[PDB]
């Protein structure tokens, strides 16, 4: 704390302050043209195509779209600013799936209209161009009374539960081969789906559950298949991933449902940790 | 297929590998 | 409580006898059933107590208590916050242990290394057993010097002086006397109170009291280091709060916070530098004992290794005190003594009465009783206990003389009296062996300058012929033509009292010397020779290189002071005294210039006239000064004058009258096989051996500490940057955590706290003693040098190291380098399963953590295998491992260890639940490789500039 510590006659804790900081300039310098060189070395080995190791990304996991801060959706359906948290983000997901953006133009493509065998584009080499997606018209969804291109959950029912499988690259799902498995769809049938089912968390729960309506590609509760492998997004930008939405009808109000919405297949496996993987939880009330 | 990974065969091979190291460190300064 | 009553009635209290005392066989009877002569010691911890006062005593209860909290949480439902602190505790506990408990077996083991002695007689013998087998009724003499083994009831006192010093605290020493003075035993004169020292004079007396039933019975380094860990402990305190409040201002849930705080504090601090400190400096005074070299304080330890300047004693320390004569010069002849069984030669006549007249005088003071059974061993080599001068002086007789033994028994004597340094005479009297010429014999311990100065008439064969004028010219002439031969000459002089003047029964004195002993008779002087011992000049040699000025203090005549001097090499071969230049060119010493004369011979009378600045110019001139004929007096005088000019001086003594001097300097040396009970414990290191080429070793060892204590500094220093850049990343560059809490515990308490000891085994370099000595004053243990090589240089490549790791297995598994910057929003929120990497997949919470773990434990690895060359570059801080050589099986030992425990952490399974830690694979273990290499080719480089240009700039800043 010496006043006569800072400069006596020569300079400030050293003589000229200068071959120091040369030193470590130089030093570290060198230093981080080594850090460069090593980093740039490990991407040569990286594929531009397909990562390198693909275990980490398990079967993959089961998201619904509106975001939900704790997994609840709690709202009223008589003040409309309860909701607009709510079916804001659902508009904001489907802007890239309307049909005003859907054009070919050497882009996407007229793909089937019934559930399909998953399309093989070609190996995940850049030999061949870029690759050609199905597209996915909005209107697949639906509501079974209401509006037209509605995304809304409104007075009656609650928001369009529009359930997402996580992209991964060059993954083709195996949906379960038997027959009477623990779905029952009435349009059951093995290829070309991968059934899922939004049940109920607990036998207290699953009393008055609700009709769980679901609002797919070939009105059948699933993934149509034809969608599947991704490519990856440098070679299949703009890629319009499946969806389904699930609506909800009837249920308890001013009371707290607790919902499981499971993805049966070969493929999908769940874990005890991962609480989003294969599966997903999402609890929702309604307000009198 | 590109994705499982061989874990458990890890295990047993890294847990030998420790223990060819932790042995060869007794016999060292036994010596 | 027996001064009161007379001796006759204790002497028969314990069946002991006045002169024989009790027998070798009654002493068992009663030392087992009284017991050893000692005192109680403090009961003693039963070593588990010791083990949990460190563990959850001390501020570290807080860690046990929110320890428990934290598991009973995740019981009735977290487990990581746990297991941290549990961690903490633990091996901060178990390692902070098991270095005080080496340290203490190693402490406790110099009270036995040597032991006290006692003068005790039994049987009419006496011998000299151990102070704790001291029964209560056996007979002791006690010695100047010494200390009284136990509480004693003086019978025959011989005018000495018992300092006690610890009743009352008074320096000043009571004079004690066999005669009843006082009532009360505390200011009484018979009883002599046990642990005290005997100053002067010597005594005999009867033990009364043993054990129990007694009087009695009823560093630097360490403060600079501890100051530097309150430095760096306070930053680490400062940042952890500040890491602390920030993330809870971007939200972590206040669980996520708390380990975010633990892992900046540990990172930052040295969690065990003090435990380290304590026990090198242990290690090596265990390993300085080995050698000849013992130290009382833990402090002597620290010093001795800063010594500037070694004033030791000619006799005992630089020779081996045993002499041997080889010249004769009387009768005006020169004479050169021959030894052989035979006696082969006959250099001279063996029938003039000189050679008996000069015999027994010195014969019959030998206080060596020789030892029954010895006659078939040569007298030669039969060994004397007594003074080394009249040891000589008989062995030069004793091959003579037919009947010792007899010899001895025809004449006695009627007093003694004690002898001194600096009084030095020892008079008694002896009967005439002539029965017509009923006189006796006087004995005096002299110069032959004193003796001429003393007698008037010389003997020359057979009459007291009158001195000439050219007899004493003669005189010096021989007196330096033999001390040129570094032997020293002795005068020794023998009288006949008149007989009218001295009755036949006459009782004389013997502290009034009434004595008639000037202008007597006088024969010849003898010299012999006190060879140094075999590793002194080697030792001196290695002081002149290493910067140590070794000055000698001796008691001698100045031509035989620097005979010897030059001989032992303190007076190196191409530097001469003036007196030296002024005998070359035959011209006075006053006008002979002093400068160009870097050493000089000081007479000791010559030194009392001497002011300070006289002496601190003196010590201020030159550099290799010896001091001829001094007092310890003088001995303390330029002892406080050396210190004076900045010198860490460490003077050695024997006798009792060197406490000032032990005292006063920085080390004080004292002797084990010679050195008195006073010096032994007035000092502050003891030689077990008188050789001087110990004192050189200890040096050398304390030198090694200062060297072996750096390296390990700047290792435990190093992993410190590694350990608190990714925390600085995390927040600043926005990028996912690369380094877990845990992890840092393990490259924290772990890899780098416990490897560090085994830098303390390291040997001397190649120049340990070819470097002048450190100043303890402008010389720090850690200094800007060491900082900035350990916080600025090293470990910035080992936290490259570990970086390079934690993007390699990103990169592998999606995530790019290129978007990695500002995903930690989105990273850590727990509400987005669908995050994209660089290829367009989604992942889910609980799967981006799993990667994000594996790459805290590549992390780890990573620092781990770049340690391998911080270990090893830190062997050396200016030799090379080329030259070095890997010999210490500890060092190899750590780095054997520390990734077996890195290959197991990772790999055992049920650590992913617990620790956090998930399995890497193969190509993960070699990221850091490179960097590794690079550490050991940027210091081999560093450290081969800095050889070659002593000096420069390298040397200037870099080396720490």
Redesign the interface.
Same mark, same amino acid.
């Given at each position: 704390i010496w006043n006569s510590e800072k400069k006596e006659f020569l300079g400030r804790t050293g003589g000229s302050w200068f +071959? #120091?900081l040369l030193?470590?300039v130089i030093?570290?310098g060198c230093?981080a043209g $080594?850090?460069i060189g090593? $980093?740039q070395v490990?991407?040569l080995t #990286?594929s531009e195509f =397909? %990562?390198?190791?693909?275990? &980490?990304?398990?079967p %993959? !996991?089961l998201?619904q779209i509106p975001? $939900?801060?704790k997994?609840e959706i709690s709202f009223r359906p008589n003040d409309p600013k309860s909701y607009e948290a709510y079916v804001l983000n659902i508009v904001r997901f489907l802007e890239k799936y309307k049909d005003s953006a859907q054009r070919d133009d050497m882009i996407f493509e007229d793909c089937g209209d019934v559930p399909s065998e998953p399309k093989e584009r070609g190996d995940f080499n850049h030999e061949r161009g870029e690759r050609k997606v199905c597209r996915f018209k909005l209107e697949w969804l639906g509501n079974c009374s209401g509006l037209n291109d509605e995304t809304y959950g409104y007075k009656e029912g609650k928001p369009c539960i529009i359930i +997402?499988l @996580? &992209?991964?690259? !060059?993954?083709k799902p195996k949906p379960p081969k038997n027959e009477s498995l623990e779905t029952y769809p009435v349009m059951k049938y093995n290829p070309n789906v991968l059934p899922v089912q939004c049940t109920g968390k607990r036998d207290e729960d699953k009393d008055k559950v609700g009709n769980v309506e679901y609002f797919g590609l070939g009105n059948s509760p699933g993934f149509p298949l034809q969608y599947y492998p991704?490519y !990856? =997004?440098?070679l299949?930008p703009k890629?319009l991933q499946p969806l389904l939405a699930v609506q909800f009808t009837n249920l308890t109000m001013d009371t707290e449902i607790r919902i499981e919405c499971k993805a049966y297949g070969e @493929?999908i496996g769940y874990?005890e =940790?991962? &609480?989003?993987?294969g599966r997903?939880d999402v609890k929702i009330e309604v307000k009198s | 297929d590109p994705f499982h990974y061989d874990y458990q065969t890890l295990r047993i091979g890294g847990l030998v590998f420790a223990v060819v190291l932790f042995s060869v460190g007794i016999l060292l300064i036994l010596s | 409580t027996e001064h009161k009553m007379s001796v006759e009635e204790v002497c028969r209290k314990y069946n002991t006898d006045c002169v024989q005392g009790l027998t070798h066989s009654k002493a068992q009877e009663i030392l087992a059933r009284d017991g050893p002569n000692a005192l109680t010691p403090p009961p003693t911890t039963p070593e588990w107590v010791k083990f949990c006062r460190q563990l959850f005593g001390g501020f570290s209860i807080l860690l046990w208590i929110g320890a428990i909290l934290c598991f009973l949480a995740y019981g009735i439902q977290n487990l990581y916050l746990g297991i941290v602190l549990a961690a903490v505790v633990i091996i901060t506990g178990c390692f902070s242990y098991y270095q005080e408990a080496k340290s203490s077996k190693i402490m406790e083991s110099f009270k036995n290394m040597v032991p006290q002695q006692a003068l005790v007689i039994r049987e009419g013998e006496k011998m000299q057993v151990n102070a704790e087998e001291v029964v209560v009724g056996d007979l002791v003499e006690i010695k100047g010097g010494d200390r009284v083994p136990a509480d004693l009831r003086i019978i025959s006192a011989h005018g000495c002086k018992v300092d006690n010093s610890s009743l009352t605290g008074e320096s000043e020493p009571q004079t004690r006397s066999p005669d009843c003075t006082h009532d009360n035993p505390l200011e009484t004169r018979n009883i002599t109170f046990f642990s005290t020292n005997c100053v002067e004079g010597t005594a005999r007396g009867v033990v009364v009291a043993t054990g129990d039933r007694t009087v009695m019975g009823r560093t630097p380094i360490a403060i600079e280091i501890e100051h530097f860990i309150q430095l760096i402990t306070g930053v680490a305190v400062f940042l952890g709060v500040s890491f602390f409040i920030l993330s809870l201002i971007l939200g972590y849930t206040w669980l996520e916070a708390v380990i975010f705080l633990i892992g900046i504090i540990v990172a930052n601090v040295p969690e065990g530098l003090l435990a380290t400190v304590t026990v090198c400096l242990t290690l090596t005074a265990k390993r300085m004992a080995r050698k000849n070299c013992l130290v009382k304080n833990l402090e002597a330890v620290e010093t001795l290794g800063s010594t500037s300047t070694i004033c030791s004693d000619k006799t005992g320390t630089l020779t081996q005190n045993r002499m041997t004569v080889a010249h004769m010069w009387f009768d005006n002849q020169i004479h050169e003594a021959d030894t052989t069984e035979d006696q082969s030669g006959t250099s001279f006549d063996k029938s003039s009465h000189t050679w008996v007249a000069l015999s027994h005088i010195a014969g019959l003071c030998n206080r060596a009783v020789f030892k029954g059974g010895q006659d078939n061993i040569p007298v030669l080599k039969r060994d004397v206990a007594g003074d080394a001068s009249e040891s000589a002086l008989l062995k030069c007789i004793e091959l003579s003389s037919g009947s010792v033994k007899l010899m001895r028994e025809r004449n006695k004597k009627v007093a003694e009296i004690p002898f001194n340094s600096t009084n030095k005479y020892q008079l008694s009297i002896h009967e005439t062996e002539d029965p017509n010429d009923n006189r006796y014999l006087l004995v005096m311990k002299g110069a032959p300058e004193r003796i001429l100065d003393r007698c008037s008439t010389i003997l020359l064969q057979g009459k007291e012929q009158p001195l000439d004028e050219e007899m004493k010219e003669a005189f010096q002439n021989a007196y330096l033509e033999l001390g040129g031969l570094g032997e020293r000459v002795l005068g020794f002089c023998h009288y006949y009292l008149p007989e009218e003047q001295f009755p036949k029964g006459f009782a004389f004195d013997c502290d009034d010397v009434n004595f008639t002993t000037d202008n007597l008779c006088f024969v010849g002087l003898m010299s012999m020779i006190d060879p140094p011992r075999a590793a002194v000049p080697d030792a001196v040699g290695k002081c002149r290189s290493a910067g140590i000025k070794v000055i000698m203090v001796t008691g001698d005549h100045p031509i035989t002071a620097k005979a010897i001097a030059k001989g032992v090499g303190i007076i190196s071969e191409g530097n001469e005294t003036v007196e030296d230049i002024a005998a070359r060119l035959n011209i006075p010493v006053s006008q002979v210039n002093p400068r160009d004369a870097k050493a000089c011979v000081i007479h000791g009378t010559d030194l009392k006239d001497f002011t300070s600045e006289q002496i601190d110019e003196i010590l201020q001139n030159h550099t290799e000064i010896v001091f001829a004929r001094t007092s310890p007096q003088q001995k303390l005088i330029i002892v406080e004058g050396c210190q004076r000019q900045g010198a860490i001086v460490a003077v050695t003594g024997d006798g009792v009258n060197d406490s000032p001097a032990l005292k006063k300097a920085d080390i004080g040396v004292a002797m084990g096989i010679a050195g008195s009970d006073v010096s032994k414990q007035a000092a502050d290191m003891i030689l077990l051996d008188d050789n001087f080429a110990s004192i050189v070793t200890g040096v050398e060892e304390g030198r090694l500490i200062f060297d072996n204590l750096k390296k390990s500094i700047a290792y435990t220093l190093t992993s410190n940057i590694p350990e608190i850049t990714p925390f600085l990343l995390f927040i600043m560059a926005n990028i996912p955590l690369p380094l877990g809490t845990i992890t840092i515990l393990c490259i924290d308490l772990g890899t780098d706290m416990v490897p560090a000891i085994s830098l303390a085994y390291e040997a001397a370099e190649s120049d340990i003693m070819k470097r002048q000595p450190r100043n303890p004053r402008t010389d720090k243990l850690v200094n800007e040098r060491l900082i900035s090589m350990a916080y600025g240089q090293i470990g910035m490549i080992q936290a490259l190291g570990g970086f390079f790791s934690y993007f390699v297995i990103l990169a592998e598994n999606g995530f790019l380098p290129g978007n990695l910057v500002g995903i930690r929003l989105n990273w850590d929120d727990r509400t987005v399963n669908d995050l994209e990497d660089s290829y367009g997949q989604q992942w889910t919470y609980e799967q981006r953590k799993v990667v994000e773990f594996t790459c805290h434990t590549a992390f780890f690895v990573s620092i781990v295998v770049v340690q391998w060359a911080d270990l090893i570059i830190c062997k050396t801080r200016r030799n090379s491992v080329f030259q070095q050589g890997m010999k210490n099986k500890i060092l190899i030992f750590g780095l054997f260890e520390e990734t077996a425990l890195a290959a197991f952490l990772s790999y055992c399974p049920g650590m992913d639940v617990a620790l956090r830690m998930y399995p890497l694979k193969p190509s993960w273990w070699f990221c850091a490789f490179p960097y590794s290499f690079l550490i050991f080719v940027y210091d081999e480089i560093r450290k081969l500039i800095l050889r070659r240009n002593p000096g420069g700039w390298v040397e200037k800043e870099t080396y720490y």
């Open positions: +071959k #120091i030193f470590y030093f570290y230093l $080594i850090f090593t $980093i490990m991407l #990286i =397909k %990562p390198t190791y693909q275990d &980490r990304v398990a %993959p !996991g998201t975001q $939900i801060q997994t +997402k @996580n &992209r991964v690259l !060059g993954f991704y !990856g =997004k440098l299949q890629y @493929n874990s =940790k991962d &609480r989003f993987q997903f | - | -």
